[PDB]
């Protein structure tokens, strides 16, 4: 009848946003509010859970007030989706409704000692011991290790645990808790897959893992899908109930990388997204059955629409230095000044003429994990210029992605059918060309690039009947928002050669210690 | 009495100069004229011999005109010495008096094939085969291979061979021939030691070699010392006879790198010099007996003052990319703009903090000859800046010269007492400090830096009794032209660490073919 709108809370590492999308999947209003990055020691990072909750609320009330000044057809938000920085863990009290300490963040390094103890003592030296259950290697990122650290180092949490009032929760859970006025204690399957406490095969908490890591299953929320009724907004913090004005359900919850996957329409097996940010996170939909990596890639849940609905699994890989390599070239090396110069210099030469730049500044991830690898350049002559170096860095980003996809293809027994791309470095047209030529598939670049926020709003809007199927979602995207297609365009001969150069160059990168 | 003057023709790779020195060894007039760098195919370089001769003549006629306005008593120049780019080889007609073609330059690569043929069919695959004779391995650099290339590819040149009218000569011989009006056909011992046709101990042409390399000895000039009567200037080419005013003897002839050794007063065994130009050339006086090398280093004539005066020998080493690396960082890479920024940036950081930059853009020479090595950088992090990369490049030039000097010590069985340094890069105070620290010797930087041109002036002055002995030469020098001295200051530990890092990075540099 009148015109529908869906809100998406995008709670990121350094800021929170609220985006209102209309039924055409167009973003029509936004507000953004940053939160404090607390660093008590080197490699430590922590957030204030209440500052994050208030930011979400502020983002909502402002974005809503702005929409109703500029859109006379806007009445209400039909539902809210949440998407979030994953692994970041919150500990709060069930009766005080308040956190017991700050929330260690996904890249925080304090769980390091715990990590070594777990590998040595529960995995006999094997960090992969539980990987056929969780999908994950023992690592500092995952929520169980941060939870364990809070019990061992934060008296309040230890206390809270004894009295049976301790709640643990990833940011999704924390937000649905407070936004509910304390009524919902839930997590979606995607975020739960990052806790090191979930069994990928059942999508339920693993009793054995909770025993062995000594995390009481009492502290954990209920696992649900990404799209269903979770709760209603029942708080008026920073005037959010008054902004929403009518009763508003929360009907979408999804981890950020997964959300980008869903927002990029990667509904079928063999469909992948890559986000070209500071680094790169590539997720591929591998289908309804989990796949485990022989190459160190993570196995995770991609999404699940409806309680106990079809569950689609995914493989995930990453590179550390993408956007960061570009910034390095500019600010540390002075290779260009205006952002546009990066692409224009790289296009000014026809190739790299034999050089390889492996920008492994913080080592190698992906399917050749090597933390001793460093940034390295080989093959230079007095004809090499900054143009060749810039182009080579771009090529390296694409080559590492090619390796990650090759690994996923073998682990999943499938092909890559296409690659959707987002992040700021996706605006580098030449990088997108090189990447298509290497992968041999079309690259799709959405002109509506708010993919993460979109993922959550799609989940929400689906559960709320704004869109009635995944096919309709796609057809609406295809009708309303432009996509650019970038098709392969070099030679197989050139590709083979650039790959042979790359593989050699990788042997020269071991340095540190 | 009456202020005597001595003229030096300094005939370089990209230009020619004439410098008039007084008997106090002060340069009192100079003029410079550039000549054309013909590159007909990639890796080929040729000079027009007539343009060079003309450049020299113009240089003489102008520098004199300018002196005589500074000193209107000046009526003549006591003698002329010549110092020249070595190996570069001219072909000319005994009766046209004109060149038959362009002169392939020392670093020209057209003699590649011929070079392989010679090692194969004449050295039994051993390129050192003639090294106890010549002091030199087979290489594109040396004059006999160019002579051969000219006989096998220039109609005019095979022709003049057959009609027995053909002369070959390095640049010293070309200059002396034309300056004479065709009357002298001579070369000094230093230049002749670079032809691959002179026996190093006997300083005589080797009939074995001219026969085997198939070069008719009728074409070769007569070997003399560096210091004695070669001819007179009898040409009027650019008013030069007129401007000389009185009949003028040529009494100095000496290869540029040895002329620098001589011009830095390295008269004693174990005294040595490095020229820090585009590349580096290090020569060490090894004394009255030739020393041969286990490390690829060249054995050559240092100097001989007089028809059977004593011949002092030298060991010689090079690196391809010294000043070229500095210019590359700027013009190819945009790492700095004004030349002083190079030093300021490198001193703005405490060290290279983990990285090594091996600038083997055109391969490694010296005692690890490897043409497959390419420019390479290892160990970078997101903290590495251009300042580290610049410093690294300076460390690496000095580390190459440390490797060269080490090799020379073994070969020669002597120490290095100190190092005289010249070239544009010797004005880099940081680079001198690091070099000193690595060698553990003093480095001496002359303020009268025209050491190459001085060399030739010294040789001609001595033969004409402007100066009466080497001891007179030095005392004049020590009294008239000062030095900067740069002392070492490392820890045996800084030094061992640097080298260890350095030797590790070298294993990573192999790339081409």
mmCIF file with all atom_site columns, N, CA and C in Angstrom, chain B residues 318-320 358-376 396 400 403 502 505-507 509-510:
data_model
loop_
_atom_site.group_PDB
_atom_site.id
_atom_site.type_symbol
_atom_site.label_atom_id
_atom_site.label_alt_id
_atom_site.label_comp_id
_atom_site.label_asym_id
_atom_site.label_entity_id
_atom_site.label_seq_id
_atom_site.pdbx_PDB_ins_code
_atom_site.Cartn_x
_atom_site.Cartn_y
_atom_site.Cartn_z
_atom_site.occupancy
_atom_site.B_iso_or_equiv
_atom_site.pdbx_formal_charge
_atom_site.auth_seq_id
_atom_site.auth_comp_id
_atom_site.auth_asym_id
_atom_site.auth_atom_id
_atom_site.pdbx_PDB_model_num
ATOM 1  N N  . UNK B 1 318 ? 84.894 -3.073  -8.908  1.00 0.00 ? 318 UNK B N  1
ATOM 2  C CA . UNK B 1 318 ? 83.804 -2.188  -9.309  1.00 0.00 ? 318 UNK B CA 1
ATOM 3  C C  . UNK B 1 318 ? 82.439 -2.532  -8.683  1.00 0.00 ? 318 UNK B C  1
ATOM 4  N N  . UNK B 1 319 ? 81.572 -1.548  -8.605  1.00 0.00 ? 319 UNK B N  1
ATOM 5  C CA . UNK B 1 319 ? 80.153 -1.898  -8.543  1.00 0.00 ? 319 UNK B CA 1
ATOM 6  C C  . UNK B 1 319 ? 79.416 -1.050  -9.583  1.00 0.00 ? 319 UNK B C  1
ATOM 7  N N  . UNK B 1 320 ? 78.398 -1.658  -10.173 1.00 0.00 ? 320 UNK B N  1
ATOM 8  C CA . UNK B 1 320 ? 77.674 -1.065  -11.281 1.00 0.00 ? 320 UNK B CA 1
ATOM 9  C C  . UNK B 1 320 ? 76.790 0.140   -10.863 1.00 0.00 ? 320 UNK B C  1
ATOM 10 N N  . UNK B 1 358 ? 69.375 -4.445  -1.617  1.00 0.00 ? 358 UNK B N  1
ATOM 11 C CA . UNK B 1 358 ? 70.446 -4.815  -2.487  1.00 0.00 ? 358 UNK B CA 1
ATOM 12 C C  . UNK B 1 358 ? 70.245 -4.244  -3.884  1.00 0.00 ? 358 UNK B C  1
ATOM 13 N N  . UNK B 1 359 ? 70.957 -3.153  -4.220  1.00 0.00 ? 359 UNK B N  1
ATOM 14 C CA . UNK B 1 359 ? 70.661 -2.454  -5.490  1.00 0.00 ? 359 UNK B CA 1
ATOM 15 C C  . UNK B 1 359 ? 71.392 -2.982  -6.715  1.00 0.00 ? 359 UNK B C  1
ATOM 16 N N  . UNK B 1 360 ? 71.277 -4.277  -6.940  1.00 0.00 ? 360 UNK B N  1
ATOM 17 C CA . UNK B 1 360 ? 71.923 -4.928  -8.059  1.00 0.00 ? 360 UNK B CA 1
ATOM 18 C C  . UNK B 1 360 ? 71.056 -4.867  -9.308  1.00 0.00 ? 360 UNK B C  1
ATOM 19 N N  . UNK B 1 361 ? 70.749 -3.652  -9.739  1.00 0.00 ? 361 UNK B N  1
ATOM 20 C CA . UNK B 1 361 ? 69.830 -3.448  -10.847 1.00 0.00 ? 361 UNK B CA 1
ATOM 21 C C  . UNK B 1 361 ? 70.291 -4.057  -12.142 1.00 0.00 ? 361 UNK B C  1
ATOM 22 N N  . UNK B 1 362 ? 71.601 -4.063  -12.312 1.00 0.00 ? 362 UNK B N  1
ATOM 23 C CA . UNK B 1 362 ? 72.228 -4.644  -13.475 1.00 0.00 ? 362 UNK B CA 1
ATOM 24 C C  . UNK B 1 362 ? 73.208 -5.723  -13.024 1.00 0.00 ? 362 UNK B C  1
ATOM 25 N N  . UNK B 1 363 ? 72.946 -6.309  -11.860 1.00 0.00 ? 363 UNK B N  1
ATOM 26 C CA . UNK B 1 363 ? 73.624 -7.529  -11.430 1.00 0.00 ? 363 UNK B CA 1
ATOM 27 C C  . UNK B 1 363 ? 74.738 -7.275  -10.483 1.00 0.00 ? 363 UNK B C  1
ATOM 28 N N  . UNK B 1 364 ? 75.348 -8.360  -10.032 1.00 0.00 ? 364 UNK B N  1
ATOM 29 C CA . UNK B 1 364 ? 76.466 -8.212  -9.099  1.00 0.00 ? 364 UNK B CA 1
ATOM 30 C C  . UNK B 1 364 ? 77.743 -8.489  -9.862  1.00 0.00 ? 364 UNK B C  1
ATOM 31 N N  . UNK B 1 365 ? 78.761 -7.723  -9.473  1.00 0.00 ? 365 UNK B N  1
ATOM 32 C CA . UNK B 1 365 ? 80.069 -7.720  -10.081 1.00 0.00 ? 365 UNK B CA 1
ATOM 33 C C  . UNK B 1 365 ? 80.986 -8.269  -9.039  1.00 0.00 ? 365 UNK B C  1
ATOM 34 N N  . UNK B 1 366 ? 82.209 -7.748  -9.057  1.00 0.00 ? 366 UNK B N  1
ATOM 35 C CA . UNK B 1 366 ? 82.957 -7.566  -7.836  1.00 0.00 ? 366 UNK B CA 1
ATOM 36 C C  . UNK B 1 366 ? 83.259 -9.005  -7.622  1.00 0.00 ? 366 UNK B C  1
ATOM 37 N N  . UNK B 1 367 ? 83.366 -9.471  -6.336  1.00 0.00 ? 367 UNK B N  1
ATOM 38 C CA . UNK B 1 367 ? 83.703 -10.878 -6.041  1.00 0.00 ? 367 UNK B CA 1
ATOM 39 C C  . UNK B 1 367 ? 82.560 -11.893 -5.918  1.00 0.00 ? 367 UNK B C  1
ATOM 40 N N  . UNK B 1 368 ? 81.352 -11.542 -6.348  1.00 0.00 ? 368 UNK B N  1
ATOM 41 C CA . UNK B 1 368 ? 80.243 -12.510 -6.471  1.00 0.00 ? 368 UNK B CA 1
ATOM 42 C C  . UNK B 1 368 ? 79.568 -12.208 -7.748  1.00 0.00 ? 368 UNK B C  1
ATOM 43 N N  . UNK B 1 369 ? 80.312 -12.251 -8.837  1.00 0.00 ? 369 UNK B N  1
ATOM 44 C CA . UNK B 1 369 ? 79.751 -11.893 -10.118 1.00 0.00 ? 369 UNK B CA 1
ATOM 45 C C  . UNK B 1 369 ? 78.530 -12.773 -10.371 1.00 0.00 ? 369 UNK B C  1
ATOM 46 N N  . UNK B 1 370 ? 77.385 -12.125 -10.558 1.00 0.00 ? 370 UNK B N  1
ATOM 47 C CA . UNK B 1 370 ? 76.158 -12.822 -10.820 1.00 0.00 ? 370 UNK B CA 1
ATOM 48 C C  . UNK B 1 370 ? 75.242 -11.867 -11.555 1.00 0.00 ? 370 UNK B C  1
ATOM 49 N N  . UNK B 1 371 ? 75.097 -12.070 -12.871 1.00 0.00 ? 371 UNK B N  1
ATOM 50 C CA . UNK B 1 371 ? 74.288 -11.235 -13.712 1.00 0.00 ? 371 UNK B CA 1
ATOM 51 C C  . UNK B 1 371 ? 72.795 -11.541 -13.558 1.00 0.00 ? 371 UNK B C  1
ATOM 52 N N  . UNK B 1 372 ? 72.457 -12.597 -12.831 1.00 0.00 ? 372 UNK B N  1
ATOM 53 C CA . UNK B 1 372 ? 71.044 -12.885 -12.575 1.00 0.00 ? 372 UNK B CA 1
ATOM 54 C C  . UNK B 1 372 ? 70.493 -12.078 -11.395 1.00 0.00 ? 372 UNK B C  1
ATOM 55 N N  . UNK B 1 373 ? 71.361 -11.481 -10.562 1.00 0.00 ? 373 UNK B N  1
ATOM 56 C CA . UNK B 1 373 ? 70.899 -10.708 -9.410  1.00 0.00 ? 373 UNK B CA 1
ATOM 57 C C  . UNK B 1 373 ? 70.232 -9.426  -9.881  1.00 0.00 ? 373 UNK B C  1
ATOM 58 N N  . UNK B 1 374 ? 69.165 -9.033  -9.187  1.00 0.00 ? 374 UNK B N  1
ATOM 59 C CA . UNK B 1 374 ? 68.375 -7.880  -9.578  1.00 0.00 ? 374 UNK B CA 1
ATOM 60 C C  . UNK B 1 374 ? 68.146 -7.007  -8.374  1.00 0.00 ? 374 UNK B C  1
ATOM 61 N N  . UNK B 1 375 ? 67.665 -5.783  -8.575  1.00 0.00 ? 375 UNK B N  1
ATOM 62 C CA . UNK B 1 375 ? 67.408 -4.938  -7.403  1.00 0.00 ? 375 UNK B CA 1
ATOM 63 C C  . UNK B 1 375 ? 66.400 -5.596  -6.471  1.00 0.00 ? 375 UNK B C  1
ATOM 64 N N  . UNK B 1 376 ? 66.694 -5.624  -5.173  1.00 0.00 ? 376 UNK B N  1
ATOM 65 C CA . UNK B 1 376 ? 65.840 -6.311  -4.216  1.00 0.00 ? 376 UNK B CA 1
ATOM 66 C C  . UNK B 1 376 ? 65.786 -5.707  -2.813  1.00 0.00 ? 376 UNK B C  1
ATOM 67 N N  . UNK B 1 396 ? 74.272 -0.452  1.587   1.00 0.00 ? 396 UNK B N  1
ATOM 68 C CA . UNK B 1 396 ? 74.553 -1.511  0.604   1.00 0.00 ? 396 UNK B CA 1
ATOM 69 C C  . UNK B 1 396 ? 75.733 -1.194  -0.371  1.00 0.00 ? 396 UNK B C  1
ATOM 70 N N  . UNK B 1 400 ? 79.125 -3.456  -0.281  1.00 0.00 ? 400 UNK B N  1
ATOM 71 C CA . UNK B 1 400 ? 79.695 -4.064  -1.484  1.00 0.00 ? 400 UNK B CA 1
ATOM 72 C C  . UNK B 1 400 ? 81.192 -3.760  -1.550  1.00 0.00 ? 400 UNK B C  1
ATOM 73 N N  . UNK B 1 403 ? 82.984 -5.922  0.853   1.00 0.00 ? 403 UNK B N  1
ATOM 74 C CA . UNK B 1 403 ? 83.215 -7.229  0.238   1.00 0.00 ? 403 UNK B CA 1
ATOM 75 C C  . UNK B 1 403 ? 84.347 -7.146  -0.788  1.00 0.00 ? 403 UNK B C  1
ATOM 76 N N  . UNK B 1 502 ? 73.250 -8.607  5.673   1.00 0.00 ? 502 UNK B N  1
ATOM 77 C CA . UNK B 1 502 ? 73.649 -8.369  4.295   1.00 0.00 ? 502 UNK B CA 1
ATOM 78 C C  . UNK B 1 502 ? 73.850 -9.680  3.538   1.00 0.00 ? 502 UNK B C  1
ATOM 79 N N  . UNK B 1 505 ? 70.517 -11.385 2.796   1.00 0.00 ? 505 UNK B N  1
ATOM 80 C CA . UNK B 1 505 ? 69.680 -10.765 1.773   1.00 0.00 ? 505 UNK B CA 1
ATOM 81 C C  . UNK B 1 505 ? 70.187 -11.159 0.406   1.00 0.00 ? 505 UNK B C  1
ATOM 82 N N  . UNK B 1 506 ? 71.504 -11.288 0.273   1.00 0.00 ? 506 UNK B N  1
ATOM 83 C CA . UNK B 1 506 ? 72.101 -11.664 -1.002  1.00 0.00 ? 506 UNK B CA 1
ATOM 84 C C  . UNK B 1 506 ? 71.589 -12.972 -1.539  1.00 0.00 ? 506 UNK B C  1
ATOM 85 N N  . UNK B 1 507 ? 71.220 -13.914 -0.665  1.00 0.00 ? 507 UNK B N  1
ATOM 86 C CA . UNK B 1 507 ? 70.733 -15.211 -1.164  1.00 0.00 ? 507 UNK B CA 1
ATOM 87 C C  . UNK B 1 507 ? 69.397 -15.034 -1.919  1.00 0.00 ? 507 UNK B C  1
ATOM 88 N N  . UNK B 1 509 ? 68.474 -12.487 -4.087  1.00 0.00 ? 509 UNK B N  1
ATOM 89 C CA . UNK B 1 509 ? 68.544 -11.518 -5.156  1.00 0.00 ? 509 UNK B CA 1
ATOM 90 C C  . UNK B 1 509 ? 68.472 -12.118 -6.545  1.00 0.00 ? 509 UNK B C  1
ATOM 91 N N  . UNK B 1 510 ? 68.613 -13.427 -6.636  1.00 0.00 ? 510 UNK B N  1
ATOM 92 C CA . UNK B 1 510 ? 68.685 -14.100 -7.969  1.00 0.00 ? 510 UNK B CA 1
ATOM 93 C C  . UNK B 1 510 ? 67.322 -14.137 -8.591  1.00 0.00 ? 510 UNK B C  1
#
